[PDB]
Design an enzyme around this catalytic site. Structure first.
Site, PDB file in Angstrom:
ATOM      1  N   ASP A 190      13.125  14.232  10.675  1.00  7.64           N
ATOM      2  CA  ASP A 190      12.535  13.866   9.391  1.00  7.64           C
ATOM      3  C   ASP A 190      11.148  14.476   9.181  1.00  7.64           C
ATOM      4  OD1 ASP A 190      12.842  12.709   6.940  1.00  7.64           O
ATOM      5  OD2 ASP A 190      11.959  10.792   7.508  1.00  7.64           O
ATOM      6  N   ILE A 244       0.782  -1.207   0.000  1.00  5.98           N
ATOM      7  CA  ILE A 244       0.000   0.000   0.000  1.00  5.98           C
ATOM      8  C   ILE A 244       0.830   1.281   0.000  1.00  5.98           C
ATOM      9  CG2 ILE A 244      -1.762  -1.299   1.205  1.00  5.98           C
ATOM     10  CD1 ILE A 244      -0.844  -0.143   3.794  1.00  5.98           C
ATOM     11  N   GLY A 245       0.139   2.395  -0.187  1.00  4.96           N
ATOM     12  CA  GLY A 245       0.804   3.680  -0.213  1.00  4.96           C
ATOM     13  C   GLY A 245       1.570   3.929  -1.504  1.00  4.96           C
ATOM     14  N   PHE A 258       7.917   0.947  -2.805  1.00  3.41           N
ATOM     15  CA  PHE A 258       8.450   0.035  -3.830  1.00  3.41           C
ATOM     16  C   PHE A 258       8.364  -1.384  -3.251  1.00  3.41           C
ATOM     17  CE2 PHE A 258      12.027  -1.984  -6.307  1.00  3.41           C
ATOM     18  CZ  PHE A 258      11.520  -1.756  -7.600  1.00  3.41           C
TER      19      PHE A 258
HETATM   20  N1  0VM Z   1       6.073   3.323   9.084  1.00  2.00           N
HETATM   21  C1  0VM Z   1       4.924   3.276   9.079  1.00  2.00           C
HETATM   22  C2  0VM Z   1       3.532   3.232   9.035  1.00  2.00           C
HETATM   23  C3  0VM Z   1       2.834   2.577  10.144  1.00  2.00           C
HETATM   24  C4  0VM Z   1       1.362   2.531  10.081  1.00  2.00           C
HETATM   25  C5  0VM Z   1       0.671   3.122   8.938  1.00  2.00           C
HETATM   26  N2  0VM Z   1      -0.638   3.228   8.609  1.00  2.00           N
HETATM   27  C6  0VM Z   1      -0.705   3.848   7.468  1.00  2.00           C
HETATM   28  N3  0VM Z   1      -1.970   4.136   6.797  1.00  2.00           N
HETATM   29  C7  0VM Z   1      -2.203   3.988   5.470  1.00  2.00           C
HETATM   30  C8  0VM Z   1      -3.452   4.561   5.038  1.00  2.00           C
HETATM   31  C9  0VM Z   1      -3.807   4.463   3.628  1.00  2.00           C
HETATM   32  C10 0VM Z   1      -2.861   3.785   2.744  1.00  2.00           C
HETATM   33  O1  0VM Z   1      -3.193   3.668   1.352  1.00  2.00           O
HETATM   34  C11 0VM Z   1      -3.189   4.792   0.532  1.00  2.00           C
HETATM   35  N4  0VM Z   1      -2.615   5.970   0.989  1.00  2.00           N
HETATM   36  C12 0VM Z   1      -2.607   7.140   0.239  1.00  2.00           C
HETATM   37  C13 0VM Z   1      -3.213   7.174  -1.078  1.00  2.00           C
HETATM   38  C14 0VM Z   1      -3.801   5.972  -1.566  1.00  2.00           C
HETATM   39  C15 0VM Z   1      -3.795   4.750  -0.763  1.00  2.00           C
HETATM   40  C16 0VM Z   1      -4.401   3.495  -1.382  1.00  2.00           C
HETATM   41  F1  0VM Z   1      -4.241   3.578  -2.735  1.00  2.00           F
HETATM   42  F2  0VM Z   1      -3.820   2.349  -0.958  1.00  2.00           F
HETATM   43  F3  0VM Z   1      -5.718   3.453  -1.084  1.00  2.00           F
HETATM   44  C17 0VM Z   1      -1.606   3.202   3.171  1.00  2.00           C
HETATM   45  C18 0VM Z   1      -1.276   3.308   4.569  1.00  2.00           C
HETATM   46  N5  0VM Z   1       0.493   4.196   6.963  1.00  2.00           N
HETATM   47  C19 0VM Z   1       1.397   3.773   7.832  1.00  2.00           C
HETATM   48  C20 0VM Z   1       2.858   3.834   7.879  1.00  2.00           C
END
Ligand code: 0VM
EC number: 2.7.11.1
Length: 302
Positions: A130, A17-18, A22
């Site tokens: 950061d 995700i995110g 990569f």
């Molecule tokens: N180190 C660390 C860490 C620890 C816990 C976390 N929880 C999240 N929350 C999260 C929310 C949506 C997401 O998914 C997305 N985020 C932004 C745009 C589009 C999407 C998607 F396309 F997947 F829907 C991915 C992650 N990120 C995190 C990073």
């Protein structure tokens, strides 16, 4: 023979995700609790490991307001994995969603929380180093903390209080530049060791970035990272706070206060929070967690 990746005894590893990463961040599920989690992965083959002591930094931070909960750190295939509480979108995601500009009320609700967030980190003898919209995430729709701004990714963190001597780390220069240029303090640009003040100045730059829509050194490019860093630094030094913070007197006061902090100096977090809560109260705002991004639809990996 399963073809399925597990982390520890109960964490099923999911889709990644995110953006960016990569493959470094994946959705995960605690099969024992039926809850989703975030799983940070780092190839065991990494040239520059950060994962496990980031894990150690989290241990040292302990359970805290706005600090994601850490559930596990263990090997996963040819990956070291850290299982974390799943949070919501970052301030940068939300910024885009709000057309790249936050209202002062939203920025102040964010600023008031982050000053406290950073003071907490600092109270655990750690400096963040950061700061950027991407590392600040709201909670999830429902998991009780969606309106709480969280701080993530402590890979660039550092203990500014020697654990044995109990002394503040020594001042020094010639530190190589690596962090994100857009928000970094001017002193960081100068190659000086970062301390508490620098986390606070970076937050200031980010607050103005939210309020203005952009920063005036933002589009600077160069033939070498070092040169870019140098140009951005030159522009930051060449832009008067009163010009950068035009229309936001409190922001100018915050910014030159932190800019003038001594290297070893403990910031007066109460003073900084008050600059913003007094302003908040005077504008007639109500700290009700109704940010600009509300009602909007955010992204979820789940
Ligand atoms: N180190 C660390 C860490 C620890 C816990 C976390 N929880 C999240 N929350 C999260 C929310 C949506 C997401 O998914 C997305 N985020 C932004 C745009 C589009 C999407 C998607 F396309 F997947 F829907 C991915 C992650 N990120 C995190 C990073």
């Amino acid at each position: 023979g399963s073809g399925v990746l597990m982390v520890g005894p109960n964490f099923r590893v999911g889709k990644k995700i995110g953006c960016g990463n990569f493959g470094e961040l994946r959705l995960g599920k605690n099969l024992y609790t039926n809850e989703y989690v975030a799983i940070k992965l780092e190839p065991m083959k990494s040239r520059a490991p950060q994962l496990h002591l980031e894990y150690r930094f989290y241990k040292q931070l302990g359970s805290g307001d706005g600090i994601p909960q850490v559930y596990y750190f263990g090997p996963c295939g040819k990956y070291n994995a850290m299982v974390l509480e799943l949070l919501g979108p970052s301030l940068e995601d939300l910024f885009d969603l709000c057309d790249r500009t936050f209202s002062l009320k939203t920025v102040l609700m964010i600023a008031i929380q982050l000053i406290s967030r950073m003071e907490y980190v600092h109270s655990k003898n750690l400096i963040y180093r950061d700061v950027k919209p991407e590392n600040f995430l709201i909670g999830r729709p429902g998991n009780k903390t969606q309106q709480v701004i969280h701080i993530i990714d402590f890979g660039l963190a550092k203990e500014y209080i020697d654990p044995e001597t109990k002394k503040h780390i020594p001042y020094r220069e010639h530190k190589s530049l690596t962090g994100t240029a857009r928000y970094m303090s001017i002193n960081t640009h100068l190659g000086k060791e970062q301390s508490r003040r620098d986390d606070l100045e970076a937050l200031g730059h980010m607050f103005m970035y939210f309020l203005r829509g952009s920063l005036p050194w933002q589009g600077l490019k160069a033939d070498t990272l070092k040169e870019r860093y140098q140009k951005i630094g030159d522009t930051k030094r060449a832009t008067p706070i009163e010009v950068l913070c035009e229309n936001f007197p409190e922001m100018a006061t915050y910014l030159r206060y932190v800019r003038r902090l001594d290297f070893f100096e403990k910031p007066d977090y109460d003073y900084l929070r008050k600059l913003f809560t007094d302003l908040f109260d005077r504008k007639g705002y109500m700290f009700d967690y109704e940010y600009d991004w509300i009602g909007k639809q955010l992204p979820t990996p789940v």
